[PDB]
């Protein structure tokens, strides 16, 4: 196991089951049944692989957390909260602190995005419940080679391999980063712009005034 270099992995952890198969699985819960834990829509049929189900789990989490990162920076930096609400500055642009932004925004848009991801997972289950064989992260049509939407994916199988690698890695690293940003802002009551910009500056306490010299 090169990730955990001086250690052994599961008696049956695979190297080709998922792209991210460097062997990192210290407790390696992959070994455990990883089945329809508490009846997780049990199928007993193809049922993918229990490892592959944990893989779909990591994929969903990392994808959501990746989007979450940009939703922690762009509200501040990129677009500077283009809330541009017809009225009601609160629950809009004004709350640039992401935690406070959630604190304000009415349950209208909350239920909007809730039903959005609800239809998302409804279609995901609709695929995967039938999409046996290779569940392949419940891919279905979503930007697949058939490209169920615009610019239907036009790449090569080697490019597809590299792209799977890109996605998986970025999702894992973003799963770290979202934790980062969240604990940051909560334990500072600010937004990332605040601490990072006074950091890249010179404190007002010491500035050597200005070059008022003759």
């Amino acid at each position: 196991s090169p990730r955990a270099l001086p250690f052994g992995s599961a008696p049956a952890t695979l190297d080709g089951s998922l792209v991210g198969d460097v062997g990192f699985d210290p407790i390696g819960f992959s070994t455990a049944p990883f089945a329809s834990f508490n009846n997780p829509l049990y199928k007993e049929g193809d049922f993918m692989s229990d490892l592959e189900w944990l893989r779909e789990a990591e994929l969903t989490h990392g994808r959501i957390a990746q989007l979450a990162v940009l939703g922690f920076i762009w509200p501040a930096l990129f677009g500077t909260f283009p809330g541009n609400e017809n009225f009601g500055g609160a629950d809009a642009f004004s709350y640039v602190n992401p935690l406070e932004a959630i604190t304000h925004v009415p349950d209208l848009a909350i239920y909007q995005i809730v039903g959005g991801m609800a239809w998302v997972e409804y279609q995901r289950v609709i695929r995967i419940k039938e999409q046996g064989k290779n569940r392949v992260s419940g891919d279905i049509g979503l930007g697949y080679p058939g490209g169920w939407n615009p610019f239907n994916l036009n790449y090569s199988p080697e490019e597809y391999a590299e792209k799977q690698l890109q996605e998986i890695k970025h999702c894992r690293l973003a799963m770290i980063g979202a934790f980062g940003l969240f604990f940051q802002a909560l334990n500072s009551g600010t937004d990332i712009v605040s601490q990072l910009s006074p950091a890249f500056a010179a404190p007002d306490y010491a500035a050597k005034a200005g070059y008022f010299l003759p």
């Binding site: 052994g8 599961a10 008696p11 407790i27 390696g28 819960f29 070994t31 455990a32 049944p33 834990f37």
Partner: protein, 163 residues
């Protein structure tokens, strides 16, 4: 009785008759016991530290008696109503006799080598947590007496950043 439960500190620590005799007749029972004790005391230590920075906002007696106000440490025991802790324990005892959640099933495979090593490490950690719970309770009560009889006032003497 020289089974798992021994390491470099002592090959069989039992400076009394305690070990010898009841050969596999009390040794397994004592393993059950020490296991349960060490696990619970580990949970205790995690208990003490976690109320110091975080606090779940639930109102134990609805309307009032909100977690955010009850003292941490031993003082909660005096606070927590007798019957309230009785109901809490009754849930715990049902859990012990029903396996309700708390990983009701699922322990992976863990081949016998790694499994034995994990079990030994478990025993050692829980044993240590027993002593950790001891020191904590000691300090707490002693301070409760003369406010800073021990000296260092803040409850968790180490981990100074918390307090």
């Amino acid at each position: 009785e020289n089974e798992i439960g021994a390491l470099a500190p002592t090959g069989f620590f039992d400076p009394a008759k305690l070990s010898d005799g009841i050969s596999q007749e009390k040794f397994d029972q004592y393993r059950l016991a020490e296991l349960k004790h060490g696990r619970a005391a580990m949970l205790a230590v995690l208990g003490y530290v976690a109320p110091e920075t975080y606090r779940f906002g639930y109102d134990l007696i609805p309307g009032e008696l909100s977690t955010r106000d009850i003292p941490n440490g031993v003082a909660a025991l005096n606070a927590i109503p007798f019957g309230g802790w009785v109901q809490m324990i009754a849930f715990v005892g049902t859990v012990e006799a029903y396996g309700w959640f708390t990983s009701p099933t699922g322990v992976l495979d863990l081949p016998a080598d790694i499994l034995a090593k994990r079990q030994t490490s478990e025993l050692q950690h829980g044993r240590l947590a027993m002593l950790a719970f001891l020191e904590l309770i000691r300090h707490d009560s002693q301070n409760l007496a003369q406010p800073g009889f021990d000296g260092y006032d803040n409850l968790i003497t180490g981990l100074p950043f918390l307090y």
